[PDB]
């Protein structure tokens, strides 16, 4: 490898990988001192759950069996993302469809924080999460809420519903972050229908953000090489074939926003060809990226022994 | 696969209104093992023609077909028939996802092989691991 | 990001492969007894080596390259047409003919 | 584990004892692979003598196939139906082994068929 | 003959009927098939081979 692959990994410093492990905190300041998100409200569109997040989220949704639960997440942003970097649990006692969190969560969340204050987490609450076992993942009326009232004061937040029977019996985490409109304002003019259907009667009170998930170096070197079935899994993937319909899904909705660009660019100020560019190119990666795994797996296998 | 031969010693002992012929010619008994043979000749077949399933099966032409078509549209079993040139489509693989579950198959071997090697001479593999760097 | 993890896990099989390769080295010189199950196992290994070499799987992978392909195509056009919009609108109020 | 207890059983007689196991081997069904068996004092000194042919018979159950024996019918000894099955099964491993499509021309000739359902049946 | 082609509401509506009928075993039968013979079906429905065409 020499030359090559020496300055590619570099475990003495921090990859591209770990960047986002790194807490700046000038800029943290310089965010919150400017306040983008005060003059838009469709600001924050992206959620990045770290994986250690999303794991210790999901064992806690699911350990409550029937029940809800609930917890807080720290985190950070940056420019439109929001980025949870952990999450801890609360002591509250709940049903299968209330949990209240009284009097024995509000010490321990400021204890808990003074206590991690002191290891070195240099991250704040950035949001609020709770579980909803087995009627999906959206904002009820007194969530909603809630999360006006987290929102209004406590400017950074985003809330997450988990729903622990889901996630069991279809073998995928099922998992939403929301955020909410001001009281009162922004009111934005078959899908009605179904939107009724599957959130709540307040579809129209707040938005979802667009959830992604990322892990470090050292991550993904250890879930690697924890059990065999991950590098099998890797060099049998299929892709092209496991999701041809999401990527179908994405050439259609890539066709619509084609069709809004043209119908904008022949005469609010948002550009919609580079977005639909963008699109377009990432999706193309991605079918590119598959190709490319298939290719090499036909070099690795198909090409040996004549 | 169960042949009409090893079935002789069973009849004997069934219940006597088990032993109910249905007007045909045929028992209740040597009804569902035909039904059990066509059944499990379709883990071993992608597709055969009538003739040949009325060979093991008795029944040599026009009852197979029957009996075939009456598996299906019950969600007993898969496949689908051309009457034209008599044969039954089973169950085809569409090559490409053979080609991943072949490889997912010789990665088994692989870790296998690898594992009985660390199994019957753990102080020589301990030294090959070590070598492996130089 | 994508051949790195390709790249790992190419690594490790070829890792188990060499190892194994190792081993049958080492029975067929003498530091290791003969083990004749382990030996019929790699034989085995090796029957399997030319994976679905089939025609039908060559028309299937030439299917799956051209659509690709064509994915391709249909996107770089959509590149160099957004490349084509900015490049005219910078054109316009540089050489306005007003 | 079925061959290891022939093994045993083999590991002290000789002459016309020794080859009368060596019969029971190729007929017990589950044993398809004499490996261990064939390191023993039968190929220390077998090559001499009446018993000669069933040595070449156990090579033949391990390497060879049914082609390789009809070709030496008159010096190897005769088989029992059971036998034939055994040595027939290892043709087709043989043949899967070199190629994972195999006609059904290759196997009517090297097995000696005449009728495709019967080939099937032993399939 | 006596109790059910007598009254006009049975003797009328008998004809709606077994065509309701023999198109609900027409479905059944072709379900497994994908090439199959118009007089196999006619075997099947009872009928010749004109009328099930026209079916």
């Given at each position: 490898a020499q030359k090559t692959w020496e300055l590619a990994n570099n475990m003495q410093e921090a990859q591209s990988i770990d960047e986002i492990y790194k807490y700046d905190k000038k800029q943290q300041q310089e965010i919150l001192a400017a306040k983008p998100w005060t003059k838009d409200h469709?600001?924050?569109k992206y959620c990045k759950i770290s994986a250690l997040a999303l794991l210790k989220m999901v064992m806690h949704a699911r350990s409550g069996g029937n029940l809800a639960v609930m917890g807080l997440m720290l985190g950070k942003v940056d420019g439109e993302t929001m980025i949870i970097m952990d999450s801890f649990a609360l002591p509250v006692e709940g049903t299968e469809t209330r949990v209240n969190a009284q009097a024995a969560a509000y010490e321990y969340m400021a204890a808990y924080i003074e206590n991690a204050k002191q290891v070195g987490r240099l991250e704040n609450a950035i949001g609020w999460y709770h579980s909803?076992?087995?009627?999906?993942?959206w904002l009820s009326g007194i969530n909603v809420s809630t999360q006006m009232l987290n929102q209004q004061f406590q400017e950074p937040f985003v809330a997450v519903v988990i729903d622990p029977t889901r996630t069991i019996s279809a073998g995928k985490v099922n998992l939403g972050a929301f955020r909410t409109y001001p009281?009162?304002?922004?009111p934005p003019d078959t899908i009605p229908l179904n939107k009724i259907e599957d959130f709540?009667?307040?579809?129209?009170?707040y938005y979802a953000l667009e959830v992604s998930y990322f892990k470090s170096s050292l991550d993904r070197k250890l879930l690697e090489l924890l059990w065999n079935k991950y590098w099998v899994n890797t060099l049998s993937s299929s892709s092209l074939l496991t999701n041809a319909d999401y990527t179908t899904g994405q050439v259609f909705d890539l066709s619509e926003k084609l069709e809004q660009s043209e119908a904008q660019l022949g005469r609010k100020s948002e550009d919609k060809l580079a977005k639909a560019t963008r699109d377009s190119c990432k999706t193309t990666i991605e079918a590119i990226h598959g190709l490319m795994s298939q290719v090499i797996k036909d070099k690795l296998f198909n090409q040996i022994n004549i | 696969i169960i042949r009409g031969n090893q079935l002789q010693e069973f009849a004997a002992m069934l219940?006597?209104?088990?032993?109910?012929?249905?007007?045909?010619?045929?028992?209740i008994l040597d009804r569902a093992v035909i039904e059990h043979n066509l059944l499990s000749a379709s883990k071993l077949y992608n597709n055969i023609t009538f003739e040949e399933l009325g060979?093991?099966?008795?029944?040599?032409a026009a009852k197979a077909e029957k009996i075939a078509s009456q598996m299906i549209?019950?969600?007993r079993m898969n496949g689908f028939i051309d009457q034209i040139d008599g044969i039954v489509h089973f169950e085809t693989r569409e090559a490409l996802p053979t080609w991943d579950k072949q490889i997912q198959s010789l990665c088994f071997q692989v870790n296998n092989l690898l594992e009985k090697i660390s199994q019957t001479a753990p102080e020589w593999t301990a030294q090959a691991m070590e070598a492996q760097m130089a | 990001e994508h051949l790195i993890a390709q790249h790992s896990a190419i690594k490790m099989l070829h890792s188990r492969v060499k190892l194994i390769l190792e081993y049958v080295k080492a029975s067929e010189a003498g530091e290791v007894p003969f083990n004749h199950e382990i030996l019929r196992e790699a034989y085995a290994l090796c029957h399997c080596?030319?994976?679905?070499?089939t025609d039908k799987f060559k028309t299937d992978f030439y299917d799956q390259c051209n659509d690709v392909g064509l994915m391709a195509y249909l996107g770089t056009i959509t590149k160099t047409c957004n490349t084509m919009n900015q490049f005219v609108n910078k054109f316009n109020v540089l050489y306005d003919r007003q | 584990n079925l061959l290891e207890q022939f093994i045993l059983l083999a590991k002290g007689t000789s002459g016309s004892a020794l080859t009368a196991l060596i019969s029971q081997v190729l007929e017990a069904?589950?044993?398809?692979?004499?490996g261990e068996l064939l390191e023993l004092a039968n190929v220390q000194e077998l090559?001499?003598?009446?018993?000669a042919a069933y040595l070449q018979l156990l090579n033949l159950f391990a390497y060879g196939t049914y082609p390789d024996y009809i070709a030496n019918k008159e010096s190897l000894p005769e088989l029992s139906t059971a036998q034939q099955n055994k040595l027939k099964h290892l043709t087709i491993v043989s043949l899967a082994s070199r190629m994972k499509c195999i006609p059904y021309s290759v196997l009517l000739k090297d097995l000696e068929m005449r009728n495709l359902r019967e080939l099937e049946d032993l399939i | 003959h006596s109790n059910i082609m007598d009254d006009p509401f049975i003797r009328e509506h008998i004809e709606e009927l077994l065509r309701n009928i023999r198109t609900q075993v027409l479905i059944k039968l072709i379900k497994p098939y994908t090439r199959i013979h118009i007089p196999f079906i006619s075997k099947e429905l009872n009928i010749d081979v004109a009328d099930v065409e026209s079916l």
């Open positions: 469709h600001y924050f909803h076992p087995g009627y999906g993942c009281k009162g304002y922004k709540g009667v307040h579809c129209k009170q | 219940m006597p209104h088990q032993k109910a012929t249905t007007a045909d010619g045929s028992s060979a093991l099966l008795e029944i040599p549209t019950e969600g | 080596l030319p994976v679905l070499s | 069904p589950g044993v398809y692979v004499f090559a001499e003598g009446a018993n | -």
